[PDB]
Design a protein around this ligand. Sequence first.
Ligand SMILES: [Mn+2]
Ligand SMILES: [Mn+2]
Ligand SMILES: [Mn+2]
Ligand code: NA
Length: 348
Amino acid sequence: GIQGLLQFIKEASEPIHVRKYKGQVVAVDTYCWLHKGAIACAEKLAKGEPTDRYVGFCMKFVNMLLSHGIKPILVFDGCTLPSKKEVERSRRERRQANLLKGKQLLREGKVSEARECFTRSINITHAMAHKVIKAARSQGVDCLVAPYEADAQLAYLNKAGIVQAIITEDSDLLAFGCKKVILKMDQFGNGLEIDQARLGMCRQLGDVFTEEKFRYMCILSGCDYLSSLRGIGLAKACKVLRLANNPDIVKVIKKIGHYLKMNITVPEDYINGFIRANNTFLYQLVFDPIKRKLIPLNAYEDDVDPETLSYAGQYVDDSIALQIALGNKDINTFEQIDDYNPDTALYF
DNA sequence: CGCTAGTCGAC
DNA sequence: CGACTAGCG
Ligand SMILES: [Mn+2]
Ligand SMILES: [Mn+2]
Ligand SMILES: [Mn+2]
Ligand code: NA
């Protein structure tokens, strides 16, 4: 989650409509619709009571995309990436804390505060996601569960040419290298569009419109993989990459004080963490729908060594990866919950 | 000015 | 898993 990236490159945005992508294919970060739909029924989820409103909430958007002649591909989150496990456990503690706090505020009579706390404790399980999967497949909509983050999966789908745009609310997709990203889309088809090619319209960027420099900037600003240094944000990082001509990022980071004229002390931890975050943004494991195989987001460069990228995701057998991608296999228990087969009728 | 961190919407 | 803004370098 690049803190305030949208406001920073606002000059590259454009109010559009989904009708623009008629006859084409788009992929959706379904967690957004799932979350927003889960907000509507927070109490039943917090109490464990049966509910199915978020499903219809997703199906509204889905039926809209279908009505405007668009081909949607719902992408869901899979396994938890080790690089973002600290934040994961943080939210894991916070949601349970807010859960118990909600259960306690339920006894004080303050129902509004209890619901307000039940809203900030929403946990999107893979069972709900699976419900959305089956419900979407009922309408003939192709689904795909990412081996890890849905961000990398959507990124691959957009960069490979399977889809032409990505529907989401997360600006991380821009740092992954998505060509076109649709944001702020309502249930009618009204949203914003941030095109990569139009990043040059942002004067505040300068010569930082290339994918590599944009990535470096996003990481230096502080991502979900590596926390930024105390005092460094988007503008100062952009300034660093603007005033620097050296392609080797390591020396640049080592002289970040020389570029910004600030007494900045850079630990080795932040260097290794930077290389780590970069390798996570570049070579995170995704799943090829057509060839049915676990692949990195981008082709392995000569300067990198795949054996030292466990944090970017661990490899498993492609059959298991297929069973996870289809949603037949549970993400946690690794047990077979469903038995869907695309061979009996995206993948083809 | 730019950035940290707290804060409140979403439905 | 954002947007807005007070407090601060
Ligand atoms: Mn994020
Ligand atoms: Mn995500
Ligand atoms: Mn993300
Ligand atoms: Na920052």
